[PDB]
Symmetry: C2
Subunit: 194 residues, 2 copies
Amino acid sequence: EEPLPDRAVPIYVAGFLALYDSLALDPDTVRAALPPDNPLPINVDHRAGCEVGRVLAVVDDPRGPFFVGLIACVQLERVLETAASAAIFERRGPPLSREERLLYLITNYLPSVSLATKRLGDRTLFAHVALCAIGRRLGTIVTYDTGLDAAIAPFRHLSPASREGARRLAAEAELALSGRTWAPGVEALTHTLL
Amino acid sequence: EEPLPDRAVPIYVAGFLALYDSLALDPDTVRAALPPDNPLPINVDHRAGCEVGRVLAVVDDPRGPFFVGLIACVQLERVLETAASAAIFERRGPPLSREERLLYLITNYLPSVSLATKRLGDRTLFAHVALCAIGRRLGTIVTYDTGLDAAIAPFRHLSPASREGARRLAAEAELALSGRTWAPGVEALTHTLL
């Protein structure tokens, strides 16, 4: 089809991976695996082959484990566009630019995330974060944005200490991923999603 | 199944029905049909039988026609719950209450709306507002909330004059609908959605 864009639109995702009781995840086991030994990848529908990003930071918070991630995948943008073309387009207004079209699509088609942990039997308890396709899996709500601070801003309930640690941990982690894209495959993503 | 709740959770929806060029809808034709002669109903996927609410107010704005609506439908809440049970539930945390469960579901499953107009050939140009099922139709993004002011608040781009006219027009229109629910039918909604 049309030619793949040369650079991926960087997408930042933020949200709570879990919420504490006011029982599977309690604050004590979360702190045991608080700093992940290995970087937690971001995939689609828990399929390791469909890796589209990387978790930038996970911070403990009184509400629950809060995370920030970076998604850099031209092929995910193309596949979501293909799904959008399979639906009746009734949006009234001027065409959105490349960045807000991607935000419009990934928020509606991948509205939640799911945290994967190792089996029950600092620590390696955290495994990966999965983008959940709507109508397939229902996880915790996230926000998508083209800015790091912008992705965290709508979460007013986060304590200022957790917010600060998140954006400083995410900034230094984003730096190690300088100029890194993800290419799981257009057909690989289409099979999982559509 | 489980018994239908006796009272519907009132849901308020807000957003832009269309956006002006910086060509189908220009500001001049919008003002011609600015005050609808008849109340614009809210339905699902443009099917008149699946009426679930009522548009409370439509205000002209430099960005575009902005609307506020009320959705009061126990059966829509039940059907969306049935769709949620058909997906893998992976949300980590305590169970959401009845109100935020409904908000969680209607935002993810019905993320956009579409404005219906009469054919091309104050005025009756505006017909109804349709809740668009994700993966079926793609319309303009809306916000859902359990409060009238809360539904309008995230739209910071709205001019303060349009915001004021919207909440005063919506408040008096909501009053005429005192204690009115919508019952399109559980099977009617299931056929359209699932």
